[PDB]
Amino acid sequence: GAMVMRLGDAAELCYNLTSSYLQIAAESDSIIAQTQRAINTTKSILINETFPKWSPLNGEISFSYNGGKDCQVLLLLYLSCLWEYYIVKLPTVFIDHDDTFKTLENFIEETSLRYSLSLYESDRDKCETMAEAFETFLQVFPETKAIVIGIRHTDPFGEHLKPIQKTDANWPDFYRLQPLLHWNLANIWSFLLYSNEPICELYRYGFTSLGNVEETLPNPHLRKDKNSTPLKLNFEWEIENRYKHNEVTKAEPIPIADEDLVKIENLHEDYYPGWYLVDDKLERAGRIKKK
Ligand SMILES: OC[C@H]1O[C@@H](O)[C@H](O)[C@@H](O)[C@@H]1O
Numbered sequence: 001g002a003m004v005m006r007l008g009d010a011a012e013l014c015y016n017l018t019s020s021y022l023q024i025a026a027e028s029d030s031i032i033a034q035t036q037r038a039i040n041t042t043k044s045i046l047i048n049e050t051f052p053k054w055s056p057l058n059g060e061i062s063f064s065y066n067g068g069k070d071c072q073v074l075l076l077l078y079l080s081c082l083w084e085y086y087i088v089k090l091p092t093v094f095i096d097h098d099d100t101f102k103t104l105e106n107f108i109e110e111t112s113l114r115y116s117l118s119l120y121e122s123d124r125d126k127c128e129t130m131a132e133a134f135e136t137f138l139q140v141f142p143e144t145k146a147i148v149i150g151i152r153h154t155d156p157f158g159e160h161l162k163p164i165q166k167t168d169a170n171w172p173d174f175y176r177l178q179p180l181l182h183w184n185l186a187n188i189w190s191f192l193l194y195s196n197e198p199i200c201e202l203y204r205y206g207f208t209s210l211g212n213v214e215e216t217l218p219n220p221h222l223r224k225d226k227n228s229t230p231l232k233l234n235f236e237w238e239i240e241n242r243y244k245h246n247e248v249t250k251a252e253p254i255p256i257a258d259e260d261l262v263k264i265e266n267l268h269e270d271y272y273p274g275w276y277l278v279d280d281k282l283e284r285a286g287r288i289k290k291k
């Protein structure tokens, strides 16, 4: 049971859950309303600024997908916008690394099958920079004009970015399409939880940012401790009223890899899941101390 949707069914599903989220009753100072506003901005960037210029059907656009929560939100929104643009397999690139979490590798494969992506992966056993990996990608796919990237302004290297922006001089020449820049961490959790799509299950165990296996720990701000003030959940409504699937769209979480559970159990500590963190400044706090 692999939870596979043909691309059109995936796009329609994403349109429907996004539309459903936009119909949620919320007040003007809520996280849900802020997320609705962020969705509307993303939709305008894609439908008004992107698709009229570059074709998402003929290989002009590739989607950079790394399995993390930001890329996943953006992929759901991108699929929704394809459906909206055209009605109302997908070329995908993953820059792989030798120090990626196994659960994340598993999740990228599972989602490629779920959403009918056409996945290209760079070679994890080659020592090369991201720019170099993308140069090789462009040799394989020379028709590529633009690449969708799921970065936010609060991420490292996120400050000096715009929604439509040519690449750096040492990259292959393409336009970066960056439609998620204005999203905040709380918006990411709200939408992802409401969507009821499978997500990388490391977040369930207290990770808030999936860096590499050597540096990344569950977030210490989420550690359970009798003598801390208990954390409160900001996403109760979304979780309790999450989007209901049907026979075609039915899915399930996939458990973390055996090796990742061993690493988490060896900590002898328990954590709230990642969606108990809403401060963007602390997203990357779960990290081995280095000199
Ligand atoms: O303006 C951004 C891009 O829009 C596309 O529709 C044109 O065909 C390209 O020549 C141009 O770089």
Ligand SMILES: [Cl-]
Pocket: 068, 069, 070, 208, 209, 210, 211
């Ligand atoms: Cl992440």
